[PDB]
Amino acid sequence: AQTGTERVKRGMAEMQKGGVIMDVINAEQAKIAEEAGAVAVMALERVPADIRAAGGVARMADPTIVEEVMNAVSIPVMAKARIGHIVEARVLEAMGVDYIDESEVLTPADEEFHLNKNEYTVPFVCGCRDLGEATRRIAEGASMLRTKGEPGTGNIVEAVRHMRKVNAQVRKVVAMSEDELMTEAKNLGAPYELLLQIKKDGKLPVVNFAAGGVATPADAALMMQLGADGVFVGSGIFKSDNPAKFAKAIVEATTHFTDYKLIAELSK
Amino acid sequence: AQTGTERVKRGMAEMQKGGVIMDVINAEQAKIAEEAGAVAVMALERVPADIRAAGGVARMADPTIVEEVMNAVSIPVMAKARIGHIVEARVLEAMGVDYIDESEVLTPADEEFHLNKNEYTVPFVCGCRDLGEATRRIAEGASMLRTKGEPGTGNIVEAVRHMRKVNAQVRKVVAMSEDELMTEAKNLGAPYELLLQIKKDGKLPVVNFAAGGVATPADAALMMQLGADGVFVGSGIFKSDNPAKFAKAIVEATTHFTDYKLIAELSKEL
Amino acid sequence: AQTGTERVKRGMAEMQKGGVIMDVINAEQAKIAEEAGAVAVMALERVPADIRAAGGVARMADPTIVEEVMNAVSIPVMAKARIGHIVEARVLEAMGVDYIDESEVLTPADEEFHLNKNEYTVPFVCGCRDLGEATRRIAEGASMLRTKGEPGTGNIVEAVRHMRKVNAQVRKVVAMSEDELMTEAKNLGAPYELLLQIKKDGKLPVVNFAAGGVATPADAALMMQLGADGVFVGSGIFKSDNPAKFAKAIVEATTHFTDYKLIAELSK
Amino acid sequence: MLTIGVLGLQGAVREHIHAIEACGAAGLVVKRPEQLNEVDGLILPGGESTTMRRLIDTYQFMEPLREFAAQGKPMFGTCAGLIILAKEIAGSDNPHLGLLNVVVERNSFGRQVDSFEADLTIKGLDEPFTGVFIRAPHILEAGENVEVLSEHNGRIVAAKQGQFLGCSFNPELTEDHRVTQLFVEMVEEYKQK
Amino acid sequence: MLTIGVLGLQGAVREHIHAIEACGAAGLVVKRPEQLNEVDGLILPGGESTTMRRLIDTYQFMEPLREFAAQGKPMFGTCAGLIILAKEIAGSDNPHLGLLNVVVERNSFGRQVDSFEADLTIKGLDEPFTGVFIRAPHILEAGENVEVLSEHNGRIVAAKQGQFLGCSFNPELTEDHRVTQLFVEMVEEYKQ
Amino acid sequence: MLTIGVLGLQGAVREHIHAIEACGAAGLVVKRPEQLNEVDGLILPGGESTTMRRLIDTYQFMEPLREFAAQGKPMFGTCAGLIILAKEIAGSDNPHLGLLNVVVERNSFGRQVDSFEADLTIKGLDEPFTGVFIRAPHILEAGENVEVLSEHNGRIVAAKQGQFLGCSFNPELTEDHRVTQLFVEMVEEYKQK
Ligand SMILES: NC(=O)CC[C@H](N)C(=O)O
Ligand SMILES: NC(=O)CC[C@H](N)C(=O)O
Ligand SMILES: NC(=O)CC[C@H](N)C(=O)O
Numbered sequence A, C: 001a002q003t004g005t006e007r008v009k010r011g012m013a014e015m016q017k018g019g020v021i022m023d024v025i026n027a028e029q030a031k032i033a034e035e036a037g038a039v040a041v042m043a044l045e046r047v048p049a050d051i052r053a054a055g056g057v058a059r060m061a062d063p064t065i066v067e068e069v070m071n072a073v074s075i076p077v078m079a080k081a082r083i084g085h086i087v088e089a090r091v092l093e094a095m096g097v098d099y100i101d102e103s104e105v106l107t108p109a110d111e112e113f114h115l116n117k118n119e120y121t122v123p124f125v126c127g128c129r130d131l132g133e134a135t136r137r138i139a140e141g142a143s144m145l146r147t148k149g150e151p152g153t154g155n156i157v158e159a160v161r162h163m164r165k166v167n168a169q170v171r172k173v174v175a176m177s178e179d180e181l182m183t184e185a186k187n188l189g190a191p192y193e194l195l196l197q198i199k200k201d202g203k204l205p206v207v208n209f210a211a212g213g214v215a216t217p218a219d220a221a222l223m224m225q226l227g228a229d230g231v232f233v234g235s236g237i238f239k240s241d242n243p244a245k246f247a248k249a250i251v252e253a254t255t256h257f258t259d260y261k262l263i264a265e266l267s268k
Numbered sequence B: 001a002q003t004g005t006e007r008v009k010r011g012m013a014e015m016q017k018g019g020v021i022m023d024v025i026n027a028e029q030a031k032i033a034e035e036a037g038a039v040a041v042m043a044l045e046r047v048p049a050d051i052r053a054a055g056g057v058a059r060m061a062d063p064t065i066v067e068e069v070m071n072a073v074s075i076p077v078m079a080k081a082r083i084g085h086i087v088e089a090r091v092l093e094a095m096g097v098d099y100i101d102e103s104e105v106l107t108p109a110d111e112e113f114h115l116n117k118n119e120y121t122v123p124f125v126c127g128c129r130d131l132g133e134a135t136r137r138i139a140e141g142a143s144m145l146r147t148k149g150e151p152g153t154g155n156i157v158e159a160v161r162h163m164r165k166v167n168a169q170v171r172k173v174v175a176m177s178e179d180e181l182m183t184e185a186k187n188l189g190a191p192y193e194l195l196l197q198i199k200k201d202g203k204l205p206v207v208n209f210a211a212g213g214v215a216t217p218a219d220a221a222l223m224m225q226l227g228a229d230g231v232f233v234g235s236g237i238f239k240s241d242n243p244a245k246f247a248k249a250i251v252e253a254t255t256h257f258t259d260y261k262l263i264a265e266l267s268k269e270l
Numbered sequence D, F: 001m002l003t004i005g006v007l008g009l010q011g012a013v014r015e016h017i018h019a020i021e022a023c024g025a026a027g028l029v030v031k032r033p034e035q036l037n038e039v040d041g042l043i044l045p046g047g048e049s050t051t052m053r054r055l056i057d058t059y060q061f062m063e064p065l066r067e068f069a070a071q072g073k074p075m076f077g078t079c080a081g082l083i084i085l086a087k088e089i090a091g092s093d094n095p096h097l098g099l100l101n102v103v104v105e106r107n108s109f110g111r112q113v114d115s116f117e118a119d120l121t122i123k124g125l126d127e128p129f130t131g132v133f134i135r136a137p138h139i140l141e142a143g144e145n146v147e148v149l150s151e152h153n154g155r156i157v158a159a160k161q162g163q164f165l166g167c168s169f170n171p172e173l174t175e176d177h178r179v180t181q182l183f184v185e186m187v188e189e190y191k192q193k
Numbered sequence E: 001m002l003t004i005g006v007l008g009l010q011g012a013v014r015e016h017i018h019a020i021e022a023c024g025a026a027g028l029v030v031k032r033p034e035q036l037n038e039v040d041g042l043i044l045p046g047g048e049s050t051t052m053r054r055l056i057d058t059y060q061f062m063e064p065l066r067e068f069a070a071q072g073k074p075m076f077g078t079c080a081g082l083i084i085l086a087k088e089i090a091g092s093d094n095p096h097l098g099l100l101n102v103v104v105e106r107n108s109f110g111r112q113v114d115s116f117e118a119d120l121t122i123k124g125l126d127e128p129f130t131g132v133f134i135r136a137p138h139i140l141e142a143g144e145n146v147e148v149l150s151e152h153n154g155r156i157v158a159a160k161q162g163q164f165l166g167c168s169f170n171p172e173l174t175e176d177h178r179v180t181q182l183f184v185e186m187v188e189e190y191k192q
């Protein structure tokens, strides 16, 4: 037996595909997410954009909250670590958190260096806006990617921008002449071997979810239509008049993302 | 017997390693720090941050308060002097304060010249952001360093930046060709002989603590993991619902900085 | 039995260490070089610095000349291809040239892309000025490096600059914290895995010669003292009063690079 | 020429389709019950059994799936899918399809940090096979009508019951298609019958 | 191969390790009690005795440290460590390990401004040793089972009692490794 | 300990020093004849045999090397080194040390493009050893006193004659130090007599 292998870390992300991961702040919300059909929950203490709205420092969640969430559900539980914060990440790992989000929406602990995610056993998801950034996160040991999008707005535009950019860059790398790839690598800031493997595989080696801006069922379907492997959705689900109903509609829109009659009913 | 030797000054700092120094404003806070396992306390009158937030001038503490702290504990007592304030520093020394922080968080008294710390018997700790600055402070007579960090924010990022910068620059100096050290020295603004001795010793000659932004047990442990010799922590401790328990958590995390199970437990309800 | 492996390509360069490679334009010069102890000769039709300062286009040498040189000596024979000139490179390979210099002192055929050296059987040497440039050549498939130096001046200054820069940057990479290496790669424009392997090996993976300004025995010894693995020297040898003797002295200074009494006698 | 479906509501669906095709069958992603009428067998992929059940309920897949099974069409569950197939789930009174006569315990190795690779000996496989166990369950017991194909440290991890194939690991996460081939053969056998 | 631990809860731990390795033994930083089983002797370093006591209590070291001594394994305390080792601390009813038969007064030279160096005649060392006294205590008295190895201004500053060695100064702040070497020899002794 | 020198006039000198130290001996780069006195045995490395002969001539190394052999000290020639050791070189009337009773043809396989790796079976080694042949020579013939340790497609590629070890490939280009170990053992046994 061997734990913590690349295939195992990425495998867990592969098993998340076609699903919705929901931000939750307590066990009551976590239960609603599971019962709605969420594939994982992201345990938060407070909504990070609000902490920073109030100008404060947004850090790892109180492990008490993460535990309450873990014990409330049987689906995977993710949590966020500040960028570069080795000990916050190790603590979450020690707690058995299923996936760590080395997250830009928390206050970066290290503004020059990201975590050496290769040395951990628990896998990490990281944000990206283009293929260069994507490949740098992967080389550091990211096992899953998401769009950075635009947190705290509900404007799908930046998720759209990042998904489209990464996807377009991948299509070009796959189609381009191999002897032109070093110049491309250099222009993108991408590790060359990764880029070459992308061309050979015809795809990114890791799953890439949409995040930051999904506010409606149409948005979630849109992101799947644009090539997302799945969708992260925020706390606004629970600001709704009927969180259960809203959560379910997001899950169904994400699954049946070309069923427009259905999506029309879900959008009401 | 000889007092005031470089070895004695620095030796005191060496004896602080692995520990936490806590900011305190009275005797009761001092006692709590000592009972939590703090290795020293930093006696303050008010928190410097919100003097300057309030636009005022942050000066040496009222000696009355410093004496109060000194009489309350048996651990070393530090206190701050404004940069370049010769008399504040000489007064702290005459009071028997154990280490003086020539501190950028007080309102500087001299914006072009730091204290000639070489001429004192009491040792000094000084802030730095990089190796050039570190080595200028040492050359002026600093016996201990700390990161400047980012005071009054609780954001660990600047403490990380500074510790990482200093530690990376030292590694490069130690590994580089000796005949390239003068160009490096000039680039850094480092005194050359000090840089040469860093290469020969394989290390900085004085201890270097983390400071300005440690808000959580994980933060404390992180600075240690990045190579700090110890941690300074601020008055936030005593704004906690349970200051004693918070202070204990920072001491344990600093001590056991790779015990992630412990740190997980330490991180709860703060 | 496999030909064209990385180990075989690089192994040839490893067998060149501690020697002098001399530019030659005919069989007579080639024989003098070999007799003097050259480890290889670089076959030139004319001196490219003279062609480009004329200010014509400097191309691959007439294969007749390369063949003359190959038939005149038992040591390896290198020759130059224009950067990106696939067919010049494939031609040289089909002729059996032992090492191709994908050379900036010829007029570049492709200003945007270097050769995909990985796809060739014959090995290549490329020029560099810094570690980022070095690792980009290696990733494309260079099996040996040299300093760019400053062709056609006899000023050792740029050779010194480049050797010092590469070496310094390697020492830093080897010593630096592993988790800081992605930031270093991005700054250098270095492929990440290559730079990480540098740290693990404690060294560049390929040999690195000095080239482009070695005019005297003392210069040759200097480059060796700065960490060069050997020395390329130009047609200047043959412009001297006694080429045989000049060539000898350079070979002896390169070999015995700390013997200052010896080097003093050679400097006459 | 064979057609094997993969239930497409959620999970590692593409992986299973790739493996089906590598064995020379046609893969069809199934998102609507009516699509069951178009395939010779069905794969229930890895993913979240919770999610799949919720979606199964919502798009009224349970009866269709039972009728599919009632028709003799073979069915293959991998991890989440094994959970959907199982007769009983430890600690739950709300089982899923219930067609495979096993009792399964969910999440029995711990959490993702515990996920692992281990080489398995599988009945009808020659060389060993790398089981990739991602938040995997185990099969606590199997009934008498069930054939044990593999065990890992004395626990059942793969099982067959006539038309039903089930395992706790995810073979589709490897480039070794031999377990998928076992299932393809099961479907080829039903497609002679 | 001798292995000597250094209690690594707080203080000048690395200086002691270096000194151990300069003498040809292996050094181990002891942060968990279980690690006491891996070492033949233990150095209690300089630092803050109050911090050490607190961490010793929290991590349940006191009994394992007592067990460690009970097995006859030597222990060496420098300043804070001497304090940890002492039977009695003047003005305190809460002593620590209580294994060395001395009465100790903490911080008895004053404060840091008074910290000093002085050359010492040490028993077993030929030529003088430079003692570096950093907020040092003194040894007010020592029982009749305690061998005095050094005095300064009529005060005992280094003492030995069977498996126990104690000094009020910090030999490990110098590059003169002879006091550590005395401990190495006691440890050799024990190992037979 | 054993000190094994490597002749350091030119070539893959450090690769050999690395192998020597890998086997637990000490290496000395030899640049001056007087340094031969400081070593129990000598490796003549890969490189250019012409360059090394030229430097051997100029620095008056040839008789000292013969003296060195006369004293019984083992000598190991890899490729260029084999050429330096050989009794006769085909097409030349100017052989070098001439202590190993073989005839060698230089550059036998063609040019660098023809350089190759092959697995070899070598007398005294269990698993195969990867021979890296870089513009290698070929041993045309070996005398009666020469033991053949390895052949490749009928070609003698490794040979031993008393204190002398010769091969046409460069074992020091690999991280497999077993051929250097064979030479260490020769030096150890010299160091007993
Ligand atoms: N590998 C998988 O399919 C994961 C299964 C998931 N943990 C469940 O219990 O439903
Ligand atoms: N040098 C030291 O170990 C200082 C000891 C500290 N003053 C104490 O009383 O414990
Ligand atoms: N690998 C080598 O040593 C090459 C030998 C060279 N070809 C010669 O004939 O001298």
Ligand SMILES: [Cl-]
Binding pocket: A133, A136
């Ligand atoms: Cl980036």
Ligand SMILES: [Cl-]
Binding pocket: B133, B136
């Ligand atoms: Cl400054």
Ligand SMILES: [Cl-]
Binding pocket: C133, C136
């Ligand atoms: Cl470039």
